[PDB]
Amino acid sequence: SVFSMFRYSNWLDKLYMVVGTLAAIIHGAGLPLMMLVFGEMTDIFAMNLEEDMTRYAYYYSGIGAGVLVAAYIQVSFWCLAAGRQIHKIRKQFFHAIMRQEIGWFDVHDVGELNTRLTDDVSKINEGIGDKIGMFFQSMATFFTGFIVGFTRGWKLTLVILAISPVLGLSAAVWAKILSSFTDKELLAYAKAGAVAEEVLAAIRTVIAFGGQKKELERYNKNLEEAKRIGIKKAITANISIGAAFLLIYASYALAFWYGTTLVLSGEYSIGQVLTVFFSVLIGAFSVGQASPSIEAFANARGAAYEIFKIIDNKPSIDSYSKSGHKPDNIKGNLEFRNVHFSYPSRKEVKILKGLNLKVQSGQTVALVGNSGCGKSTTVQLMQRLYDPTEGMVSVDGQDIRTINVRFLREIIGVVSQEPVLFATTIAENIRYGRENVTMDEIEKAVKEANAYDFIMKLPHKFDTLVGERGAQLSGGQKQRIAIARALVRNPKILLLDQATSALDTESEAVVQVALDKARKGRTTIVIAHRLSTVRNADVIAGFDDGVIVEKGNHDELMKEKGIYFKLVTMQTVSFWRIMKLNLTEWPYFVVGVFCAIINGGLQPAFAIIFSKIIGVFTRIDDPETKRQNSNLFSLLFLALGIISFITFFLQGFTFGKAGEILTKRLRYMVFRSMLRQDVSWFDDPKNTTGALTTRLANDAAQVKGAIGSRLAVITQNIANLGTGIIISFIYGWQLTLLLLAIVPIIAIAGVVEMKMLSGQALKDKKELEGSGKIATEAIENFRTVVSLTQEQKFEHMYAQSLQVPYRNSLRKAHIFGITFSFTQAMMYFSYAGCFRFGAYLVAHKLMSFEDVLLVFSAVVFGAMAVGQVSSFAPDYAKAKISAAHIIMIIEKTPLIDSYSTEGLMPNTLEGNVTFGEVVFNYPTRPDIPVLQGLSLEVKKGQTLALVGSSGCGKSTVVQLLERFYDPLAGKVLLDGKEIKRLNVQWLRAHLGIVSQEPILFDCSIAENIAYGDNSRVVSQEEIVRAAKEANIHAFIESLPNKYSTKVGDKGTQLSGGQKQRIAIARALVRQPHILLLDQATSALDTESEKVVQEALDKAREGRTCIVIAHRLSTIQNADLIVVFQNGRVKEHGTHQQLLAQKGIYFSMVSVQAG
């Protein structure tokens, strides 16, 4: 556990840290070393000045040169050691996640990882960089003060030193606590990031059903628990400083008393105590500078727990292992024998209860059965995503468990049940099948898949960017690309899973010929619910209760009159705006700023205290009195001590609490603003689920660190150094002019520092969203990328996007290092200058050296406080850009608004939809005319069927009615009223849709069905009443935990039919006036298809419907049918009228002639 964050440090990284620490000790001694020349001048106080002062000044000019080197070496080296290690952490951690199996993805929540990559790693960067360097600068200063003490003092040093262990232990006690709190706070943010990743993926269903309020308030809760842990961390860290500062001034008071005995004993002089106090007191302020460094390291330690926990884990069925067995001449042989298997998520249920099969080379197997018998499990087992409990899957004699994984997976082509594509060009989607592929092969492969014509018709033919998960293309076209992708591979075993579900009759027909032409050499297994495709296969198989019962040729199974016979028979500007948002918390700043000046301004004042204390010690010549008045001063240190406890704690608590209220305020509004946006906004190439969720975590975290507790210290350092120059202006004279004249040189260096950094961060921020895009793309589609065997390519792609920040991180160190060293060094020369200037003025008798020595002593305490403000600049530069983007997104307003109350909400509705002369284009592709002036009539109590070939604008009508996009020209009238003129939500409350490819949320089944109806308490009796009509009651009832079983991410646990049937239920909870079915019975059984139709037909009257489907048996029943053609509605009417006038409809139905 201990020091497990520095695992990937090279010999050159080691060299940086060792050389940095040695320089850090040398740099820290210089401020303690300045007091040595003062002590000898006090000894002289019991001709001189011009010879003595120049010697002491001459030393300061040399020190400044030593600081300019050491400071650069100190700061620069750690920053390099951080940047290189962080680069290796991100690359290793991502590689570790891809090494996992599917069962691990099934159990744990994958949505948490995306925020663990960007935010949680960035916390470590702050911990193990410059703060480690400064920590040693502080610690050298602390000890080097005592090193003078041992020479100058025998007991006085020991008396102060002996109360170091409390400071030493206290730091360990508070750190170990707040280190534990960090793990729990980060876990709260991870739970929030999962909600954002889920919602932004399925935004269309969220907009459709209109559940923005519920998802917003749920997202809010996770932030509430994060705030409560945050405020606890603030209280703890600020108390750590108060007690430490209290104990030092308390111990200083104890040290004074024994100092009073010098007159009685005669052990040492008053010249000694001034040396001892001036030596030892400097280190007191160094502790306050060290308090942030320990707090950073403790949080950075707390950040590491969960990252290395994933890296330390080892897989079961490893893909990266090269110790497997790989044969040469793989003849086609597949054997199942007595195979039992159950998933990890529900171990109680038994799906496969002993089956067996033999498939020789040159055989196309058909698997038939009802939804739930486990056809997809068999296909998913072949790839070896899960292993069997008993039974052996042997290939060509040898068992799968003995042979190699990667070698096995690169000879199996798989078209999954519901395909998914990656957001790139069409060429790259085809290229994921195999690396070294030529254009000629792709040309041939597409033409076999029958997806050539539409690719030729689109501009940028092979360079058209498909959306996230292939959303921009149609349902049919998307499926063909998956078919091509398998055929480019050219494997031995081909595995089709309902490959011709969304495709029409003509596309199925020609694709069948291409597959059947080049079948002889291959081995094939085909899943299908159409039976015409099943007719010409070699062997058919029937599942039943886990076991495969029936087998054989078409003739035999017909004569045997089993399940197959029944199936065949049945078919027949930053501070001004950002500060203003937190107008409420005004009394926190008033107390915080007031307290910072009082506790900050005490440190330069010591010289005034020490001068008066020294003066009162030698005021009156009489000795007995000195005993009494000296005792009171010791009480004064305790009094300041007890107040110091009150000031520092309150200062830190007031500022610390203020930030945590704002942090949550920033997040809540941005997520609320993003959820208002139009669909057109989500279709932009720049906007993506991964790109957005990264934008949430990064922007808030950048703002939080700059203006939180860290703001407070700067206020203390400004007041300190202000008080320093004020008392220099008051008591001193002709010094401020020489001191202040060097300040513009720091100012010129400061402006060029921020200008170089602030310009750099904008280019860095833009790239990191590009980095985030790939992770969310790879993680969400894990089954695709595992099946395709493309684990390296994504790591290589991920390595590119990280390379541009990596350069900036290295460059940043040198810019930051040069400014620090210069800003630090220019002060020392000023401390040389003032003494040398004092050498001239004292001689001529215009300035009093006794008073000059005090201002010299007073000004030099700020030297460290000057160094604190120098380290602030980068944080301000990153916040400036981060803030601008937040105000940009919040202030933006959409075209069609969901939160606007205005519109017309008519008390009743007749339910008559009309379309007339409608032209429309999508925003992403402006030139292509999808609809070219169509018209359509829909009245109450009627079902209108829409038909045509794949990609003739059927699903566009559904989307146009739901107000995702508005028409360019034309008109839509609801009951003789413009849909633009109506209220937005009001419309979406009445009508309800069933999408082409359903999506579900990570929740219980009851809540997914209850999600359909919002703004009302859904009764359970109605849920079961609906789910009885939907026809999934017996399935849910047989399952353990009833409705409380948690469905997976995007409906991954349940089978297609099971979720698709839920989607049907979710629609029927509302009892809508207008209804829209877009291939609602795509993948369902013949037994189900009737029972689903019965409920619709029995309760058809009253409401209105528009059906889209390829099954002519459904369209047979409908009132009037409509046929599309290149945008124009060519054919329309009733079944007898359309069949009489023998056009395309006759050609469409006659293709099924006997």
Ligand SMILES: Nc1ncnc2c1ncn2[C@@H]1O[C@H](COP(=O)(O)OP(=O)(O)OP(=O)(O)O)[C@@H](O)[C@H]1O
């Ligand atoms: N990853 C999984 N985790 C848990 N249970 C699963 C998983 N995949 C499938 N199941 C369950 O196993 C059973 C069989 O599912 P499977 O999809 O293999 O059957 P199917 O006949 O192919 O379904 P369909 O006909 O709808 O395509 C179902 O009851 C389903 O809920």
Ligand SMILES: Nc1ncnc2c1ncn2[C@@H]1O[C@H](COP(=O)(O)OP(=O)(O)OP(=O)(O)O)[C@@H](O)[C@H]1O
């Ligand atoms: N958001 C979008 N951006 C760009 N083009 C789109 C978008 N949505 C649809 N299209 C294009 O419009 C054409 C037809 O659209 P649509 O998918 O509605 O037809 P469809 O009848 O639903 O097709 P299918 O029957 O194959 O599902 C397709 O070629 C598709 O690429």
Ligand SMILES: [Mg+2]
């Ligand atoms: Mg299936």
Ligand SMILES: [Mg+2]
């Ligand atoms: Mg469609």
